[PDB]
């Protein structure tokens, strides 16, 4: 695994992406790595924000599926038109799949400007594949097609004109030891979809925010690296401002900062760290009745982001906000730590990453087991559409 180490780039913000090629001869792109979605599509037509996209007709090796494809989300959507070709990691296995590739034709607010990214690589489950779950995702076919374990990792690791540069690390196929550091802690995944979880409990410096449960995973709870976020849903996220305010209330910032739409600064050297809290989620823990915690610094939720105008003080953007489509882990979250995306197992492992950012004082942290006794059931039961029943799945 020391050839897939630091295979990741990106800028603070706009999504780690790892470098893979598609076609023969092979065209290299840059693609997002997302745990949030289940499909590969890549760029296929001119974009004012590409530097490059899939040449679908260069390819000895395309075949046009004939059929269309399309994706919107909460931000961001996309279409093109499905087919198969070769694609590799070039910093990954040394493997050839051939894969679906979606290729996109048009896009909405999807491509970002300065990202340097072409694509997306959804890492998550067939059942959100579009435009059904019978299109088979990537992860899927390198599995069934090569020796491959059905296991991946992801080591994110943190960070005047431009923003800066992140790096990290995608383990295909199992776990560097090298990248973490202690004990490795295993929460199940409550359902093959997205990377669905469940958290049990929140503490914002030890205090428990005290609400039922269930409201944590309103109406999930799932880990996504193309989301830089931690977002938590409406109730969750007030409760939980409102803690880290009165915290940090030494300083009195702008409504803007909390909304996570403004930076703010201190010399150089001298944040006060320390006024604000750490955060600690209670994950499911294999065993009934059992969770373990992840703990992240303001260091991981509190982002830098350089000012031109005084690129001498050291700024950051609120990096915690908040959702109407349940509690995302996204990059903030998965900064402190080496996750472990155990498809075989059906479970997702955390240990503290050997390059979360950190001081003299705090670490982020895992740890457990905490105990439980009668532990109810935080999961919540997402209300089904007809849409969704009347779907048959052969
Ligand atoms: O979480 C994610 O998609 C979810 C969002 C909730 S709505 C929905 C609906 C269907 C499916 Br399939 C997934 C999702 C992916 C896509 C992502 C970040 N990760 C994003 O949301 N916009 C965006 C924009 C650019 C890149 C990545 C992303
Ligand atoms: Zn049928
Ligand atoms: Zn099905």
Redesign the pocket.
């Known amino acids: 695994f020391v050839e897939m180490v630091d295979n990741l780039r990106g800028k603070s913000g706009q ?1 780690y992406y790892v470098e893979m090629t598609v076609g023969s001869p092979p065209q290299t792109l840059n693609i ?1 790595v ?6 590969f599509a890549v760029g296929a037509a001119p974009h004012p924000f590409l530097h490059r996209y899939y040449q679908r007709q260069l390819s000895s090796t395309y075949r046009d599926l004939r059929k269309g494809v399309y ?8 279409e093109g038109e499905l087919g198969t070709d070769l694609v590799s990691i070039p910093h990954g296995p040394n493997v050839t799949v051939r894969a679906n590739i979606a290729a996109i034709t048009e896009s909405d ?4 400007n300065g990202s340097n990214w072409e694509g ?1 690589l ?1 890492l ?1 489950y067939a059942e ?3 435009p059904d779950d019978s299109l088979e995702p990537f992860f899927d076919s390198l599995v069934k097609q090569t020796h491959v374990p059905n296991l991946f990792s992801l080591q994110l690791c943190g960070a005047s004109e431009v923003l800066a540069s992140v790096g990290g690390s995608m383990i295909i196929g199992g776990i560097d030891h090298s990248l973490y550091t202690g004990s490795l802690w295993y929460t199940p995944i409550r359902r093959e979809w ?1 990377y669905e979880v469940i958290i049990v409990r929140v503490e914002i410096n030890g205090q428990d925010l005290k609400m039922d449960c269930k409201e944590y995973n309103y109406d999930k709870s ?1 880990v ?4 830089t976020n931690l977002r938590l849903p409406k109730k969750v996220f007030e409760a939980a401002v409102k803690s880290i305010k009165a915290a940090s209330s030494t300083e009195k910032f702008p409504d803007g900062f909390w909304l996570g739409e403004q930076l703010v600064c201190w010399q150089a050297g001298t944040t006060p760290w320390n006024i604000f809290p750490v955060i600690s989620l209670y994950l499911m823990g294999e065993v009934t009745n059992q969770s373990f915690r992840i703990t992240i610094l303001p260091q991981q939720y509190l982002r830098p982001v350089e000012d031109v105008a005084t690129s001498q003080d050291d700024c950051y953007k609120f990096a915690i906000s908040q959702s109407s ?1 349940g509690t ?1 882990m ?1 990059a903030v979250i998965m900064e402190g730590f080496y996750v472990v995306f155990d498809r075989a197992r059906k479970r997702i492992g955390f240990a503290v990453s050997a390059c979360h950012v950190h001081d003299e004082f705090r670490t982020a942290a895992v740890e457990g087991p905490f105990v439980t006794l009668d532990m109810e059931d935080c999961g919540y039961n997402i209300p089904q559409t007809d849409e969704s029943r009347s779907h048959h799945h052969h």
Do not use: C, E, M
């Open positions: 999504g997002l997302d745990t949030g979605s289940s499909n994706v919107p989300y909460t931000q961001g959507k996309w607010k999807f491509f970002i997306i959804g998550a959100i594949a579009r997205y799932i996504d690296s193309g989301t489509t995302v996204g």
